Amino acid sequence: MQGFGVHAMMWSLNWDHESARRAIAGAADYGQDFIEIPLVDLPSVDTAHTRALLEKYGLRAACSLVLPEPAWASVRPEAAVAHLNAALDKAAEMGAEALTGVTYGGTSERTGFPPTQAEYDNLTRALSQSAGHAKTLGLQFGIEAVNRYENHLVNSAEQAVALVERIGADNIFVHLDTFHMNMEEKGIANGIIAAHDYLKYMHMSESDRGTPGFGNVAWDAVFAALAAIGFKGVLTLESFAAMPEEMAGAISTWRPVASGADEVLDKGLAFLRDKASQYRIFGN
Amino acid sequence: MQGFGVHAMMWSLNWDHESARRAIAGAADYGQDFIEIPLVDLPSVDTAHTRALLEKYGLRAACSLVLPEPAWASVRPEAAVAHLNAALDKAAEMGAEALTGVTYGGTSERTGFPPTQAEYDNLTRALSQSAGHAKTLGLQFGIEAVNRYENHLVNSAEQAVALVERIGADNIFVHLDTFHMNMEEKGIANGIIAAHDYLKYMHMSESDRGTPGFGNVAWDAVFAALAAIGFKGVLTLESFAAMPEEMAGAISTWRPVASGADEVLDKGLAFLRDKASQYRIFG
Amino acid sequence: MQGFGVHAMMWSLNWDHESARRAIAGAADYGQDFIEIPLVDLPSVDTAHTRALLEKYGLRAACSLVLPEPAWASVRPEAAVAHLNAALDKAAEMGAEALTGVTYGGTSERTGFPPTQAEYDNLTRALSQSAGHAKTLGLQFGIEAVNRYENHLVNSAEQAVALVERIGADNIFVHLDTFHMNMEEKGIANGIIAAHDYLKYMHMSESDRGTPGFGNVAWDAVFAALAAIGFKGVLTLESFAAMPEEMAGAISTWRPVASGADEVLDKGLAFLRDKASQYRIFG
Amino acid sequence: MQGFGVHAMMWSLNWDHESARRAIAGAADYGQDFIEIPLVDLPSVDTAHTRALLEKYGLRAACSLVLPEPAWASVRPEAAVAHLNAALDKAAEMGAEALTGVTYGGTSERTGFPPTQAEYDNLTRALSQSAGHAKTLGLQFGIEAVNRYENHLVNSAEQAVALVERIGADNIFVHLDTFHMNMEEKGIANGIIAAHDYLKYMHMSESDRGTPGFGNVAWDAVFAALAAIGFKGVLTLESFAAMPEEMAGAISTWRPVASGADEVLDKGLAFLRDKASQYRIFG
């Protein structure tokens, strides 16, 4: 997996036949290599229809999800493996090439205490199996580190790396997010450096989830590190500019993050491509 | 209120006699003008003792708090006024010059939905009451904007300004925190600019709550904005480096933020002093 | 003088009838309020043609220059006044609203020593006279600070401010350049802050003279300072992307700065506009 | 060659016995691994004295120079070889491990035109010979890229790398200077990345030659690039804080860059070591 991606949430988080068409068509208009398709309600994902759309528009896909609470691997690793293998099945059915995201827990997950080794044992057992399952379907398995307010288990790149190395699977990659790194990394570039070889996927997100290039992310340090480590993965725009007000509680977002999704698609994708070119990402 | 401050959490969770002494003596050791004293357990505070120690060490103080959930102003405005007024009495007894912090809500407060005008009405009525009570005590009353994950009500500087103007009191100031602004402000300096009529207090906090100078906060933009708006208030260091693991849940902090309070105090207070001089913050 | 500007150099430094319409039409195409028109050879400048173009395409203009060595005001103030007054005449004829740039010396000017009071007396004498001539023509007069390698007299905003203060004229403004400030200012925002009473004109130039947004200028600090001091002048794009190689020696530019002028105009003017929106420079 | 260095110019660029003593003892008091010793007047350099002082204080050293104009390699390559080999002889006698700096030209060197192939042929011939001499002494040979106003031949890391690879010697390294990169590199970290193979030496220098951490150099991008390419060389502080007013013409510096060398040494070296440790530069 290599190139420029855009998260389907730039159009919506729904994945009915209409939303799938709008996001895939739109990602094609903006000349993206990948679309990241969220898996929210697995039973309602028509993998035949989606693959038909991806093939029609010449688009590559990765899937992502957050584990629902009944499936949080911290506490319920067996339900984690079920939900993750079910999502992996939809992913491979669609022609997607990876499942990534918060594949190990929730984005509102909290015990009140620091992570315990019992919890990490649950995470590694659960992800041991689902990654093995992904292996049988030709898929790569992603682990996205998120900030301390969303999850208490994987916040820094070093924690994500440590987890990947304990699982010991050869098809798990670290997935970083500049919005989360802006809080978690002691100097955002240190996150990319720590993940180095396991880093194959980036959410390129402004500090306020608005428009990359118009916030507090130090994009020169981010692109410098990506170039210097020889990054050859996927740079996916993630912004909440198209998020409807009903999504607020699920993304902890209480006011508009930008003017509108079209301006974010225009200015943000251009910014990522222009900065990628300035730093010769993918320039072998 | 003007000058350099340090939050007492660099030494102490609580505020018993020996914690109060260690924090105040420590702040005095680092030449600070202000110590910020958190008020958590109001009956356990010995304000007369604190006042004597502040005077012995030549320190000025501001008090701060987060409202406990029974007193969140958005839903229980009358409980909020009762708690804030009790807090202000204790602050006044100590000789503090202001009560600030999350004086309108919690840091684990969430409704699931964006803030409603009914909630803002409750906030406006409650803070107007307690700012008034602060005014009778000779105290200023601060509103600290925090990030979206701690609270749904006052996140950006513009929201803080909007609330301060709705309240309409002359002793209320806006209090910004660079750790929160690093997420909430569309360019961190925009928060300082937005608050320029009311900004009197800063938490100078690195993006990971570690050491200022060694994270992702754009300090040149922060200090430039402070200088250009003519900032005359307090620059208070806030870091979680002394926080014990027992507090992890209260601050949503799951791993060390730095190597130790001693080097955050050494390096971070020096960094803030050195940047203030570079930008001529106090002349 | 308010708004978004582009230096005519994005098309050509020559100002014949061909080059003039090409530049003014191009500036109009990009929705610019101002074009900055260089005055290298005053006899070659046909002001009647230029003002006609400016009016048709709805463009306003500032003129700029660098003093030729026979006219360097530090040594030959009388020759400076004569040269400056002739440029001001041509500027007024073509309907420009200001003469700015290195109006006080050269861009290869150096003495080997720090600037003396006698040189600044020469500067002040010359600029006082020509600024007054400018005032009678209804023109403002600008002083652009440049880096230590181009000139030894006016490098920092503080220096430009002090010179403007000494002259004591109402129509002289400070003109700053982000390319030069990136070297000269101890934190680029400190130059904008220092010039707050006199700053009416910016050259928004990347650190390598390339494309704003794609270099080392700290644009957040620049725009934050601009907004915070309530800047109301012109933001003019300066880039060497269209300079022919025969200009190399005159601008000490030995290799390409970007991938052609069309890309710089597209990306760079948009970037200046977007950042201005982000920091509400003009609203 | 690895560790932290300080340029002897922080105390003097004269190298009489007392100046050498003051400089080497000074670098020792600030815990440096290296001191960078400028070679200007060769006959007044007592090498035995210097070597003894280096070993006494446990200091390692690199030498550096700028070619005098009669020996600029681009036009007078035979004279460049003669000068470089003599400087190499003195460096090895002193116990220094390398000769670096502007080893290929001047800092006021300028043809009026972009650099030519013939000029680079002269550079290749001269530097390949003198690097071959350096190898017989067991020294490495450095090429420092400087900005467009000091030299027209080696400005960007890219240019330096192309010249190093053309020569083909295994003891030539690229030497970068953040002061010069802040102008020459399209994103300062791009210069470090382009030099990755050959980068063994840095001048860590603020944008105004003042105090690192208090200017416009994007230190997080610099240290990120250095960490990510696995840099294992020397981080040498360079600042003009201690420069006497009589040096102004030689370094094109017309006003103080800082308040004093003692503050620059204290704050700047501490900034470099703190960032180095933040980005885990060494081990």
Ligand SMILES: O=C(CO)[C@@H](O)[C@H](O)[C@H](O)CO
């Ligand atoms: O940043 C996040 C969540 O904090 C997103 O990457 C999320 O994991 C994705 O939307 C899953 O589909």
Ligand SMILES: O=C(CO)[C@@H](O)[C@H](O)[C@H](O)CO
């Ligand atoms: O940043 C914070 C919490 O988000 C602190 O300012 C807090 O409000 C204060 O510590 C209360 O005592």
Ligand SMILES: O=C(CO)[C@@H](O)[C@H](O)[C@H](O)CO
């Ligand atoms: O920055 C510069 C030169 O250093 C330009 O602003 C120059 O002064 C102008 O082009 C003269 O007309």
Ligand SMILES: O=C(CO)[C@@H](O)[C@H](O)[C@H](O)CO
């Ligand atoms: O940056 C520079 C030159 O501009 C220094 O590296 C210089 O070469 C030094 O004085 C050599 O001794």
Ligand SMILES: [Mg+2]
């Ligand atoms: Mg993400």
Ligand SMILES: [Mg+2]
């Ligand atoms: Mg705070």
Ligand SMILES: [Mg+2]
């Ligand atoms: Mg200019």
Ligand SMILES: [Mg+2]
């Ligand atoms: Mg140097």
